[PDB]
């Protein structure tokens, strides 16, 4: 028993992780066989990331400028090349610990675990979701660009994130291991708007549903609503609609519990009408929407990873 | 910016989990050295379990009785020792990934993180707190037994935390690495209650000033209060008494944000006696207490581990 927000063990990441100096930018690098993946703006100074042009200054660059550490150990740097907002650092010596791996880009609604790391070494670890609006809340600090997000299946390792920057809300934006943007965001210090966030619906359904396997029922009721009749309630709200197929992915977690999806929607409609009168689910006053219907079950069921 | 509840980075832990196999339980193991640690219970029954002599028990077990898996690799058990609630068997292979560590025993209201493993394979971390009552607010199923929590400072890790087994509460229970129980609780089968929990005072304080290091400062108020004062408020919701230790303690915090002490105790009773009013502190609605003052100057200073 018991809902935690939980994140993949880290040590496949671990293991990839160095730090990437270029003139006074210090960030974190991934090193995969012999290449060490990094944002782009490690070429930039403090004065070049307001309206730089990565292309020019990428020219100017030579292989020693760019000194990577391996724990103690020097990369030797043999070639380089941009891709999209990323830089590839061709070194000589594959990472003997490189897991088998992936780049994939995720959805918004969908979770992953960043491994926070500063000089190449790793911080810390947490879970978090990519929001509607592309950002993700992060916990981030000068020096963690670089650091990495990512999923484990059985023995591989997802690579989904890499992290660049701060919006002026506290959040955060990044690209994917090939360099593209997560939303509208540019690798340049101009004025940039998150823009308006959603709550992330199926989510929430999934994390009640985990209550309900905990013990938490209180909230359930007799009701019930149709899709239509629940949507327009979500779009009241600022709820993310609810489709056809967030039913059927809702469907193994309405088989566990036998509370019916179209129920369980009836539950969150008096919820967002009423609020919660001081009670609690799972530890929360509030409706969580980080959890998605395959975390549930992964918690619930106790898949592991190697 | 942003804060995140953090756990530390696994891999050191991940490198030293094993499986444990006696009769027709399985569980998780810690190797160490040449030594592997697990719940004593592993040499019970699901028949033993109810009220177990396992001095008896012991006497009658072989070494070759203890089937230990390190990934695919079989372990030679070449002898066993019982230490209070945990065992100890001795391996004829020294764990070449072990690294360096302790074995220490923590305070209600401290942290740790928790490799949650299955099989002696790893399925996720999370962060928690020893509650006051001894109890842990963990994420554990059926054969979680042998997972361990613990803290990292630089390299060495401090394991302070087996997983025995959980409270009809959905709560959990378990020892220290020298196999003594953390509260009154037994590694029996039999009706064992919590206990009357409160909540952790100085880490909500310390939640508190990580919020205002975060831009949250709608419940800051001009008000002030003393030590005494607060602590009737305090005892009357069931919260720790604040000591001068742990005025101290939150000195650093104090220092960085330009808030006394005892300021932010006037705020925290305003919120204690009012509520929040719908509004949220670091995305919570309620008042977080898993955070010791260490855990926020760490975030929100970046400290790093290897
Ligand atoms: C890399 O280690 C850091 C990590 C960053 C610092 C604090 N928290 C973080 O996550 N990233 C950077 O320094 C960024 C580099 C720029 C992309 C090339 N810069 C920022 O994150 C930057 N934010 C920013 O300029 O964008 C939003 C904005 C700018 C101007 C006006 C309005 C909004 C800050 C200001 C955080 C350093
Ligand atoms: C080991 O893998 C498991 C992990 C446990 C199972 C579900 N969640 C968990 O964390 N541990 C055990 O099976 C325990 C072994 C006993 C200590 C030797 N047993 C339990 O956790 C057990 N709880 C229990 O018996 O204590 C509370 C109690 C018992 C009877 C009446 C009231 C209260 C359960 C019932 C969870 C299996």
Redesign the pocket.
């Known amino acids: 028993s018991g809902f935690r927000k939980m994140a993949f063990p880290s040590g496949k990441v671990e293991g990839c992780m160095v730090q990437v100096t270029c003139g006074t930018?210090?960030?974190?690098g991934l090193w995969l066989d012999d290449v060490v993946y990094c944002?782009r703006?490690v070429i930039?100074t403090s004065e070049?990331?307001?309206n730089?042009n990565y292309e020019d200054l990428l020219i100017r660059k030579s292989n020693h400028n760019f000194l990577v550490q391996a724990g103690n150990v020097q990369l030797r740097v043999i070639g380089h090349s941009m891709q999209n907002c990323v830089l590839k650092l061709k070194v000589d010596t594959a990472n003997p610990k490189t897991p088998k791996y992936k780049f994939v880009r995720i959805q918004p609604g969908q979770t992953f675990s960043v491994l926070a790391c500063y000089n190449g070494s790793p911080s810390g670890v947490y879970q978090c979701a990519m929001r509607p609006n592309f950002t993700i809340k992060?916990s981030?600090?000068?020096?963690?660009?670089?650091?990495v997000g990512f999923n484990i299946d059985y023995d591989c390792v997802s690579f989904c994130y890499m992290?660049?920057?701060?919006?002026?809300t506290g959040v955060?934006?990044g690209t994917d291991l090939e360099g593209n943007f997560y939303g509208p965001?540019?690798?340049?210090?101009?004025?940039?708007?998150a823009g308006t966030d959603t709550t992330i619906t199926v989510n929430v359904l999934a994390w009640l549903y985990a209550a309900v396997i905990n013990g938490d029922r209180w909230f359930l009721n007799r009701f019930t609503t149709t899709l239509n009749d629940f949507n327009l309630v979500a779009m009241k709200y600022n709820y993310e609609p609810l489709t056809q197929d967030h039913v059927d992915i809702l469907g193994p977690l309405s088989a566990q519990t036998g509370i019916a999806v179209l129920d369980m929607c009836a539950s969150l409609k008096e919820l967002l009408q009423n609020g919660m009168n001081g009670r609690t689910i799972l530890g929360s006053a509030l409706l969580e929407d980080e959890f998605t219907p395959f975390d549930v079950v992964r918690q619930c069921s106790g898949v592991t990873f190697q």
Chains 1, 2 share one sequence.
């Open positions: 930018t210090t960030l974190n944002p703006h930039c070049d990331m307001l730089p992060g981030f600090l000068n020096g963690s660009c670089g650091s992290h660049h920057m701060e919006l002026p955060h934006a965001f540019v690798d340049r210090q101009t004025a940039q708007a």
